[PDB]
Amino acid sequence: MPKKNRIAIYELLFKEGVMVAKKDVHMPKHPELADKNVPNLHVMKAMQSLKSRGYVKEQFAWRHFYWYLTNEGIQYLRDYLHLPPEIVPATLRRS
Amino acid sequence: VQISKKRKFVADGIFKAELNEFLTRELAEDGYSGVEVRVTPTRTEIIILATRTQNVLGEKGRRIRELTAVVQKRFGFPE
Amino acid sequence: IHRIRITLTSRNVKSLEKVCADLIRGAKEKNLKVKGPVRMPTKTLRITTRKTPCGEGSKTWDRFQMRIHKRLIDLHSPSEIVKQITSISIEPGVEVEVTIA
Amino acid sequence: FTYRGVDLDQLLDMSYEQLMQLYSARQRRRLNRGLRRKQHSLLKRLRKAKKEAPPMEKPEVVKTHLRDMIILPEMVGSMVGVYNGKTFNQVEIKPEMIGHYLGEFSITYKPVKHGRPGIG
Amino acid sequence: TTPKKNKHKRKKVKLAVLKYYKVDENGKISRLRRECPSDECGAGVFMASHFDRHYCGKCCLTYC
Amino acid sequence: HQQLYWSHPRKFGQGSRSCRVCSNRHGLIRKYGLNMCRQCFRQYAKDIGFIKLD
RNA sequence: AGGAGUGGAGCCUGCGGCUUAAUUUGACUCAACACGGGAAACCUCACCCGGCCCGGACACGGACAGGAUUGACAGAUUGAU
RNA sequence: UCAGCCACCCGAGAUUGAGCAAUAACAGGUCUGUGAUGCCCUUAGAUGUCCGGGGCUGCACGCGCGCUACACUGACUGGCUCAGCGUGUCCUACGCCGGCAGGCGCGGGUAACCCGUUGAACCCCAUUCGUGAUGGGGAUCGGGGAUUGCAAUUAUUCCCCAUGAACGAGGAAUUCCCAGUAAGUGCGGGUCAUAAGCUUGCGUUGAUUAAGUCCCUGCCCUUUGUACAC
Ligand SMILES: [Zn+2]
Ligand SMILES: [Zn+2]
C-alpha cells in the first residue's frame, strides 16, 4: 500500500471513532473515503493489521465490518495526528 | 421519483432485520432485548430495549455515541 | 384549491383504521368538505419457499404474505391547515404521504 | 474454390462490409458487435506468421486460445493449434471452412467406445 | 514436470544518480542519459539510454 | 496482475448476484428486491413482516 | 363402484451403468430418482488442463538504505498487451 | 328416548378449503445456506483465490417423474365471444418498415390512475378434408433470417421453407381421486442477459360412480401364552 491512503483513515477515528466497511475485496472505491481513490481492500486489510495491534474492536454482521475505538486508541491518535488534548471530540458535547 | 410501495414496505423490513442482527451480535452481553424503530422524516429514532440500560450508555453517555455514528455511516441516511 | 389528497399505507389494518378515524374526526373538527377514506384494493405479496434447507423430505412448501392496506382521504382546503392535522397523530406501523394542488 | 458464388482470390482483397453479406446472421452479428484486442492480436500474430515464414513453407503452428474465432478469408492457409481444454492440435485451414468457428475441429471429448455394463 | 519458479530481483548501483549525473571540475552538471519529455517525470526524472532505445521509469516510453 | 484480476465481467448471472446476509449464490429470492437466500429468508421472515396466514 | 391414467411409441428431464483428461457431489422402500429453488454457453463451480496473486495479520533474528519490493516497451517463450 | 344419528321445512349456507399442530423417538437428511460449529486435513509446483479453456450434456443398456400423441366426440382456414390470481424502471400503449421473428421513434406507469376493458385457450358458428400410416402425429435433419450477450460451434433461444420416423389405445403390474372434485384448457409467479415440457398459484368448461366394509394394504385396542426383557 501507499502511505497517503492510510493517513485519512485515522482522522474519522477521533471525532467519532468508528469505521465501517463492506467485505468486498474487488471493490475499487471505498465510498466513504471518496476523493482519495482508496480501495475497499486497502481499508479492510489496514484495519485487519490494526486489530492485531489491538486498536479496533471486531464486530461483523451480514456483510459489513465494524470497528470501534479503543480507550487506548485516543492517546495513540492524539500524537500521530499531533493534536492537543484541549479540543474535545463528540464524546463531551451534549450535557 | 421514489420506489414502489411493494418494494418500499419490504425494504423497511430488511432494515430492521440487519439492525436487529447487528444489535444482537454487539450487545449480546449487556442483555439486549429488542429494537423499536419509530420512523419520522425528520428523525428516524431507534429505541433500544435492554436489561441494564445505564451500562449501555457508557461513561455519561459514551458507548451508544459510537453506535449512533455506526448506524449513521452504515445505512446511508445522513446525520 | 383542488386535489388535496392524503395517502395512508400500513401493514396492519387496526392501527391504519384508527389513524383514518382520527384524521376524519379532526377534519370534522375543522369543518371542511371531506371525501372519506376510500379503500384501495389491498396488495398481498406471495413468497412460496421450500420448507427444508437441504432438499431431502416430502416436498412441503411455505406460504408467506404481507398485506398492505392502502387508504386515501381527500380534502378541499387551503395548504396551511392540512399540515397542522397530519402532524398530531404520529403513530408507528403506518406511513403518511400528502399531495397538494 | 468458390464461396457464395465468388472464388477465393477476390475474398483476399474483399473489404469488411462487403465480406459481411456472404455470411449467416450469427457471423454477421459477431462482425457487427466488433472484434476486440484478444482477436486483433491474433490477426497480428497471424499476419506475422505470414511475413516471417518463407513462402514455400507453411508457417509454424500459431497455437490459439480463441475457439470462438470465425475462420475469415484472411486466415486461410495458416497452421493453427486450437486448445480443447487439455491439449492442442494442429489443424490445416482448408479454403472451404469460411462460415465456421475455429473451436469445432478440436473435439473436446474422446468419442465414447462402450464396453460391457457394470452392476444393473 | 519440474516446478520452474523464478523472480527477477533488482540490483541497484551505489546511488545510481552517479550513472546519470556527471559534474567536472568547472562545476557544470552534465547528464548523459535522456530526460523524458513527459510532464509527470519532467526535469528531474531521467530515461535510460539503451543499446537501441531509451526507457522511462514512469511512462515506459521507447525510442530508436 | 492489476488488470487481469477482476477482468471477467460480473454483470448478469448468478455470479453477479449473491445473498444479502451470507454471500451465497444458490436459491436467491430476488422478488420485491430482497436478494436473500431461500434458507436465510426463513430466518428473518417474521422480522421482515412476512407471516403465514394459510 | 367407477373416472383419468402411468407402465407400450417418440421426446424432455432426474438416477444408475459404460466411457472420460474431467464427465464435481449429496440423497436409495414408504421417509432417493423435475430433489438439493440443481432450467449450469463464461461466471455460477465444486471437477480436469494450465497460468498469475498473497488476500502469510502479528512477534522474533537477519538483509537492510552499497537498496528488499513493483511496473516493466521490444525480442524470445506463451493462451494472453 | 343420554350423548347423538337420519329425513324435512325455513334459509346464502345444515361437510368451504387451508394454516398451526403433543409426549417420546429416528444411530432420517443437511458441515454444499450460513462470519452456526468441534476436531482432522490443507496453506505459497495452496484443497485459498483469480484468469483462460474444457466438463457438468458425453451413450451399446436398465429405472423413475412428465410432455406430445395415436384421430371424425377429429384436423385445416376464416368469423364471433367471454376471465382471475399476479408481476412491472423494465412492463408496454400509439405511428411507420417488413413473411415473421424483428427494426425504428414517440409517450404512460414506482402503479384500482399506464400496459388494461388485462379484447386468453379449449368451447361456439361456418368452409375444406373423410377412416388410409391420411393433410393424424410431429420427432430427426438441410438451408437461410433475427434477437440477448464479452462470446451462440457441444444447434441458447425465436421465425420461414423443406424431409417425414415410430406411433393402429399399450402385457405383468401400479398411481391419484368422492364436488366447481377429477379431467380438458389456457394465463401468471419463481428460476430469468437469453429462457419452461419443471414447480407454485389462478381462472374457464365440467362429469361418471360411492355415501360402505375390514377382504387385501397398513395402523390401533382387548382376551392367549411364552424359553422373551438387543
Ligand atoms: Zn513520469
Ligand atoms: Zn443466505
- Non-local CB neighbours of D14 within 8 Å, separated by 6+ positions: D73
Contact A64/B26, CB-based, under 8 Å?
no
User: Number of helices and strands (H, E) in chain F?
Assistant: 1, 2
B75 CA to H86 C1' distance (Å):
32
> For the CA atoms of chain D, what is the radius of gyration?
17
List F51's β-bridge partners, or say none: C65
Q: Which domain holds residue B63?
A: 5-79
Q: Cell numbers at residue B76, please? A: 446511508
Which CA distances in Å does D75 have to A9, D62, D79, D104, F37? 55, 11, 9, 16, 49
> For the CA atoms of chain B, what is the radius of gyration?
14
For chain C, which chains pass the contact test of at least 3 CB pairs under 8 Å?
Answer: B, F
Contact B61, B76 (CB under 8 A): no
Q: Cell numbers at residue A45, please? A: 486489510
Question: How many structural domains is chain B composed of?
Answer: 1
A41 CA to G54 C1' distance (Å):
13
Contact C66/F39, CB-based, under 8 Å?
no
F15 to chain A: which residues are within 8 Å by CB? Answer: none
Contact C49/F41, CB-based, under 8 Å?
yes
A91 to chain B: which residues are within 8 Å by CB? Answer: 62, 65
Residue C70 contacts B where some CB pair is shorter than 8 Å: yes
C29: helix, coil or strand?
helix
Contact B17/F32, CB-based, under 8 Å?
no
Q: How many CA atoms lie within 13 A of B68 on its CB side?
A: 15
Report the chain B residue with the minimal C-alpha distance to residue A19: B70
For residue C27, which of C50, C44, C59, C4 has the smallest C-alpha distance? C4
Question: How many structural domains is chain D composed of?
Answer: 1
How far apart (Å, rounded) are the C-alpha atoms in residues F15 and F6? 12
Question: How many structural domains is chain A composed of?
Answer: 1
Q: Which nucleotide's C1' sits nearest to the alpha carbon of F37?
A: H33
Q: Cell numbers at residue E57, please? A: 521509469
> For the CA atoms of chain E, what is the radius of gyration?
16
Burial-class residue C16 by CB neighbours within 10 Å (0-12, 13-18, 19+): buried
Q: Which amino acid is at D114?
A: H
Give distance in angstroms: CA of F26 to centre of ligand 2: 8
Please give the resolution of this entry in Å, rounded to 1 decimal: 3.0
Indicate which technique resolved this structure: cryo-EM
Give distance in angstroms: CA of C68 to centre of ligand 2: 26
Q: Is F13 annotated as a binding residue?
A: no
D26 CA to H136 C1' distance (Å):
36
* F41 membership: H or E segment, kind and range: helix F38-48
F40 CA to H17 C1' distance (Å):
30
> What value, to the nearest 5°, has the Cα angle with vertex F1 and ends E59 and F3?
70
User: Number of helices and strands (H, E) in chain E?
Assistant: 1, 4
Q: Which domain holds residue D85?
A: 1-120
Residue C45 contacts B where some CB pair is shorter than 8 Å: yes
Q: Which domain holds residue A12?
A: 1-95
Contact F50/C64, CB-based, under 8 Å?
yes
How far apart (Å, rounded) are the C-alpha atoms in residues D31 and D1? 23
B11 to chain F: which residues are within 8 Å by CB? Answer: 33
Question: How many structural domains is chain F composed of?
Answer: 1
How far apart (Å, rounded) are the C-alpha atoms in residues D40 and D16? 14
